[model samples]
Structure formats: C-alpha cells, structure tokens
Target: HSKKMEEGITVNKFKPKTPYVGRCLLNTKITGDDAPGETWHMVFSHEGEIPYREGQSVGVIPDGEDKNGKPHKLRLYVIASSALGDFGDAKSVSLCVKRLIYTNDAGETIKGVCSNFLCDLKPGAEVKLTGPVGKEMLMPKDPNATIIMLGTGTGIAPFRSFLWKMFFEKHDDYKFNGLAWLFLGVPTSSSLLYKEEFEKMKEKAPDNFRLDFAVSREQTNEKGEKMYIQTRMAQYAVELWEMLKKDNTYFYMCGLKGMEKGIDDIMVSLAAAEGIDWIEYKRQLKKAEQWNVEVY
Candidate 1:
C-alpha cells in the first residue's frame, strides 16, 4: 500500500458511495451552432486533491437524484488537460464533455444525464467527483517513441491532454523527443475541439508534433469519399506501415469503436500486401505495449 503511494498512484479513494466534493471553476462551449453536436471545456477545482494525469478520465456523479429517486450514476469524462492543467498547477482539472440531447427510437427525446448535467453546471456549483481512471492511454515511457493517436469527434479529449504535456506544458522528468502525430475526426470544422490550442501547439513544435484533421462534412479523399480518419491515414500508408514495423512506434486508438474498426480495415490490407497477418501482428504490438486502444 505504501509502495504504491510512493509511486504516486492514487485511485479508488473516492468512489460511488462517497466522493470528493468539487466546484465548477469555468464552463464554456467549445463547439458552435454549425456543428451537429455541442461540447464544453469545463474546469473544476478540488484544491490540490486530485492528482490526475493526461490520457485518463475523471468521473462526475452529477448534482441530484435520478428519475429512479436514487442518486445519479457516475459518468467518466475524458480529462482534456495535463497534470499541470490549464493553470499549470494541480488545483484544477479540465474536462471535454459533449452535451447530448437527442430523439431515441419511437420519437421520445432523451437527454444524456451526465453530459447535460456537466454542461449545465455553472461556476461555483458543487460537484461530486470520482476516479482519475484509465492507464491504457498514457504515453510511453520512452519519450522518443513515435506515437500515432487516432481519435474521432470528442474522442480527441485524451489526445488533447497528451498534446498539452508534449508541447504546451513540460514535465521536469520528461522531455519529449518523439513524434506525436495526431489525427482528429469530426463532422465539420465547427465541431473540432480545442483547435486554437492545438494550432498553437502545431506551431510551437512543428518538427516533433504533427496534426491532421478529418472533417467529414467539409473534406473528401481523392476518390471523393468523405475523409474519415481511416481515409486520411491511408494517404500515408507507407509511412505508417514503416513505423508499424518498428519497435519504437506506438499506436493509440480512442473514441468510437467503429472508428477503430475502420483503422483495422486499412491496416489489414496493408499487412496483406506484405504477406503479414495484420491480426496477429497487432497482438505482437500489444504484447510489446505498443498498441493502446480505448473506445466507447
């Protein structure tokens, strides 16, 4: 127990039955009306209580009882900022949450309790908080490893956390020497999250960091197909293939599972061209801890 503490790993201290209390520090819409969905960049302060890192998620228990007359269930929202957070300290944590309200089958409108609960929170409102879960999405220990991050829509949150650390902020023990190639997919330009911050990051370290966007509504491939993440990735099949064969390359996939499948189809054929079994090759990558995937 003390050894884990010495290693600075904290978890399950706050759970469903009892949670750390926090207050919303800031809430702002990150997306616009032209977008099909709305997302928010929200910051919450629990003082120096939660030591959260990038590529992880934090849970919110919302503010009140559910329709069943019980307290609402916890929901995990991806942490959008790094350990230093936007303020460059541990006093706060930031979340990238997309507010969801849509019509379900048979015409009844259903609002996602957690997403809407979070977006509706105002500064100074108290919030119930839980774990900073997810170790799979963390960056590799080797700073020089070439990392490929593929995310769709709000799935970019964890990648945003990584970029914040790789470029915008720095760690005393960690200096990034690797290439962080990020591919973000959204329906339109308006739906792209954290574009401004990422733009600055793009310019800050142009050589070490690369950014790609797949705006399906506004962009298309050479064959006039909607430019999904897979389509964009296919444009550099050879480069990616070369990287995949290397031991230092790490591939991370987050967001929709369908998007993950799309990536497989692209790579499966690439592996086939070389008489390699893509399915088993990925297992080797996983065995080497080079493949990290977290989809929802």
Candidate 2:
C-alpha cells in the first residue's frame, strides 16, 4: 500500500443523521448566461469548527424526501476554497456546483436532486453538511514539488484550493517555488471555470504558473480534431515525460472517466518511444504516491 493510503483517513465529524447546519452565504453563477450548462459558486457559513484540507470533499444532504418518504441521500462535492475559507476567516466553506440535467430516451428531461437543490439555494438558507473526506488528492508536503493538475468541468474545484494555498494564501511553512501546470478542458471559452483567477495567477507568477485550456468546441488539435485535455498534454508530451522522470513531480487527474483511457493511451506511446513500459512506470509512480486520480 502507498504511504498515503497507509495513513489512517479522517472520518466525517458530522454524518447524515447529525450534520452541521450551515447557512448559504453566496450563490453566484460562474458560467455564462447562454452556456449549455450551469455552474454556481456557493459559500456556506458554519458556526462550529469544520477542519478540512485541500483536495478533500464534503457531503450535502438536500432538504427533501425521496419517493419512499426518506430524506434524500447525501451527495459529495469537492471543496473549492482553501482550508482558511473564502475570506480567510475559517468560518465558511465553498463549492463549485454544476446543475445536473439530462434527457432520457423518452425525451423527458430530469434534473439531479441534490445538484439542483444546491444550485438554487438562496442566501441565508440553511444546508446540512457532512465530511471533510478524501485523502488521495491531498497536496504534497514539499512546496517545491512540481504539480501537474488536469481537470474538466466542475472537477476544477480541488485545483482551485491548491492554487489559492500556493499563490494567494500566506503560509510561513509553505511558499510554493515549484512549477505548477494546470490543463483545464471545457466545451467553450465561456464555460471555463475561474478564468479570471487563473489569469491573475499567471500574471502574478509567469514562471511558476502555467495555464493551458482545451476548449473542445472552440479549439482544435494539431491534427484538426476537437481539442481535449489529452490533446493538450500531447503537445507537451516530451517535456511532460521528462518532468515525470523527476521524483519531485506529482500528477493529478480529476474529471470525466473517459479521460482515463485517452491519457493512458498517450502515455503508453510516449513511454514506448523511450523504450520504457508505461504500465510499470505508472506502477512506480503510484507506489510513490505521486499519481493521484479523482475521476468520476
């Protein structure tokens, strides 16, 4: 087992039966008005202490009952803000929630229970919260370690916390001096999450921060196909492979499950070119706890 997994994981102090009641402090739209999907930035205020770390997730139990008359089951969402909270007060937590909607074969449109509930939340409304769960995607202790983060859609949540802590938050023990590369994939430029914040970080530290976007509908790959995260990674495959050779480099993947195969295929070819086996090399990375995946 990896050292990280060997460490005892922290359980949620608040469970579904007894959860912390937090008030909605803010609910702002992050996506464009005309965008195909909806994503909202929500802040929940809690009085009691709820300690958490970057890459951890929290549970939300919507205020409703199911068909059987039981309360709705909890839905997990990655926390977007740093441990210090939005205003650095440590009294609040934030989430990047995308309203889930899908059309069935019968041509009926259905909305996700918890997603719609959280998205439509009004300020001053109360919400039940559980957990500060997950430990696999936790940030490394070394501030000088290279971090490569790839995310699509609402998966950008955890990376936001990492960036906030590395670039914005003040920590005497951790001042990032290492390279941080983020590759974000979205359907359109308008759907890019935290575009302004990422741009600001690039401007603040041009050398330390690198931001790459793969807009599937608006961008094209070198071969004239729809651009995806793997396509963007392919553009820097050689450099990325070189960086992966370094022990200090850490890779994180979080997004749709489809990305897994595309990423593995690219790495397989890249490793073949160097006469190395991709599977074995990946195993080494996992053993060292340098590879983190939180795809859904």
Candidate 3:
C-alpha cells in the first residue's frame, strides 16, 4: 500500500462574522446516561450549500450574549458525518458533541455555552455556523492508503467521518481498498461511542477495517497497566512501527495532548533499537503530511 495520497484542500465557505444559518434536523444521545458526560450526535440541514468533506470542523455561535455583553465566541467541533452524510446524501452536516459540564477549582459548576446550546436544540432550531474549518486533518486522497487513527472521547468525531467514507459508503472514485485501524480510549465501557456502528462496519468490511478499544476504567492488564490507548498500542507496537515506515501509511491523531506523550514514550524505545530518532522521524512524517494531528 505505497500509493501516494493527495493534498491541497479548500476552506472558508462560511466565516465567523457572517455564518451560514442551518436548522437542526436530528439530535440523539449516542451514549448511555452512565457515561461520564453527555455526548450528542446531531445533524443540521445545510440544503447542499455548505460544501465540506471528512475530517473538517464547523464552528457554532451560541444564540446568547456573554457575561461581558458580547456574542458568544465560536466553538469548533470536528464533523462526524461523511461528505455524503448519515442519510447517504449531502443534504446535511453533523457533529458529535460532549456537553461540557464540570466543577472548577473554585467549586463553580460551569457548563459549555455552545455545547449545551447545540445539545438542547430541537428539530427546526436555527444554528449559526462558520467554516467547515480546517484542512489540517483532511482525508487522504489515496484509496489504498493505510490509515492509523488514534483518538479518544469526542476526538472520535473526525475518525468516524473517515471510517464512514472508507467503509460504510460507496463512491465512484473512492472505494477504499487498504486498511483502517482505530485505537480509541474512553473512561468506561459505557463511554465507548459509536461502538455499534463500528461493529457494523467491521461486519461488512471485515478484512479492511480493524477495531480496538481501551476502556480505561474497566480494564487493567496483568502488568497492572490501565488499558489506555497507549497501553493497548504498546501490545502492537512492532507491527505499527513497521507500517509507519511505509510511504503510504498515515498516522492521524486526535484527542488529549497527553496521549501524544504516551505514544512517544512507547515508540522511542523501538525507534532506538532501529537507530532512528523517533521525534525526528515523526517530523519527517509531518513534513510529508502523512502525520495529521488535531488535538484540543
């Protein structure tokens, strides 16, 4: 799978000052109540005006004033639906948002303005939206490119987009013939978002798609290591390292910046054995645009 992936992406279909207004078409809770936070899968009708692809983000402005008497700042969320959308047509854009609510160090319970606004939206509710924003994580143009995706929590959003385009949908010029391996980590068994959908993809594209999960709160290995993504990744470090050396292999990372450190730690020792400086090697990958990362 050494086929080259294409580059050159476009953006700015909508901007912050004057955003496209879309209506909520569907909103559903994809995770159990027992999960740590509220995560919603939402779709907004674009009427085929907002052109976008997999792995891009869209910004939302909450319909309210801030404490300082200004409009709420935009919050960008990675798009979860493919370019074709969940309905198999490009009539909409979608998001996977985890409603932000947590206690601060000062004992104040704060909620995310935009996430809450989005989650509480009803059918036909209008939403203010900006760009299908970034090209930093665009899907590779090569159909046979091997993609190694590492994500956690709502970071799974963009990866879900990639997987849908890869396996679940059909395209005249974009049939995926390579491999997609995903390593996702979540706090509990109930926090495994999109498990059912990924399992269905696995059933249909058994050989092309591979799935692995690290349910941190639910499992520990014999070595007493919590089964985080990095922990599980260590178990397959050899093969992963080998695949990474290939020209057509892509490493797409999303989630907490903490996991990046964990990945480096796991890879450093292996790259050392091969007389390679892992960070430098990683820089090369980034230079070639084969390593795509989107962390927030």
The residue ranges of model 3 lying beyond 4 angstroms of the native Cα positions read 1-9
> What is the number of backbone collisions in each predicted candidate, taken in the order shown?
0, 0, 0
- Per-residue lDDT, model 1, residue 166, is 82
Q: lDDT (CA) for every model shown?
A: 0.85, 0.89, 0.88
Superposed model 2: Cα runs more than 4 Å off: 1-10
RMSD of each: 2.6, 1.9, 2.1
Question: All candidates' TM-scores?
Answer: 0.95, 0.96, 0.95
- Candidate 3 matches the true fold with a TM-score of 0.95
Model 1 residue 171 lDDT score: 69
Q: Write the residue-wise lDDT of candidate 1 on 1-296 in tens digits.
A: 11011245566667888889999999999898998879899999978788876777878898779888899889987788887888987789898888889999989999888899899999999999998776777777777879899998778988988888888766688788889899998998899888888899889889998899999889998789999999999999999999989988988888887887888999999999999999999998887778888888
lDDT against true structure, model 1: 0.85
Candidate 2 C-alpha lDDT tens digits along 35-142: 779999999997636788888899999998999999999999999998788888778999999999999899999999999999999999999999978887888877
Model 3 agreement with the true structure over 8-112: per-residue lDDT tens digits: 434778888889999999999988878988889999999887888788898999998989998989998999998889997798999999898988999999987
Please report the candidate that would top lDDT against the real structure. Answer: 2
